């Protein structure tokens, strides 16, 4: 329930083939840019880096939790259906 990991933009590369090593069963791969993920302070800087290096991108907007409206009194309302049946 912590949001400290949702404050920096990230850039990542599409997942590629990941097969099983015949000897022991490791996750063998042949994609060098698989574990490389960059961080960016703002979306514009990230897209500037993507265009600068000539990488096709598809930017997703930053979702933000909509501001709710909490109230302790509504738990014990008299006319409404928000009255809780337990504590």
């Amino acid at each position: 329930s912590g949001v400290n990991n949702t404050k920096k933009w990230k850039m990542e590369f599409d997942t590629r083939e990941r097969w099983e090593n015949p000897l022991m069963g490791w996750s063998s791969t042949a994609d060098p840019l698989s574990n490389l993920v960059l961080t960016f302070s703002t979306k514009e800087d990230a897209v500037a880096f993507a265009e600068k290096n000539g990488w096709s991108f598809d930017v997703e907007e930053r979702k933000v939790p909509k501001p709710k409206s909490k109230s302790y009194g509504a738990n014990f309302s008299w006319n409404k259906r928000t009255r809780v049946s337990t504590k």
């Binding site: 309302s77 008299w78 006319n79 259906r81 009255r83 049946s85």
Partner: protein, 45 residues
């Protein structure tokens, strides 16, 4: 009459029954008045 402070008279509680409280609450209801209504028959309704 002579202010007999020496005796106890609250002995009526000795001859009480299991349902005495609720039974005496029952016929007391006709002296009550219409309870207020909140609208819906239940918070879940």
């Amino acid at each position: 009459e002579p202010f007999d402070n020496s005796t106890y008279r609250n002995l009526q509680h000795h001859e009480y029954s299991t349902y005495t409280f609720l039974d005496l609450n029952v016929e007391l209801s006709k002296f009550r008045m219409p309870q207020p209504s909140s609208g819906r028959q239940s918070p879940r309704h």
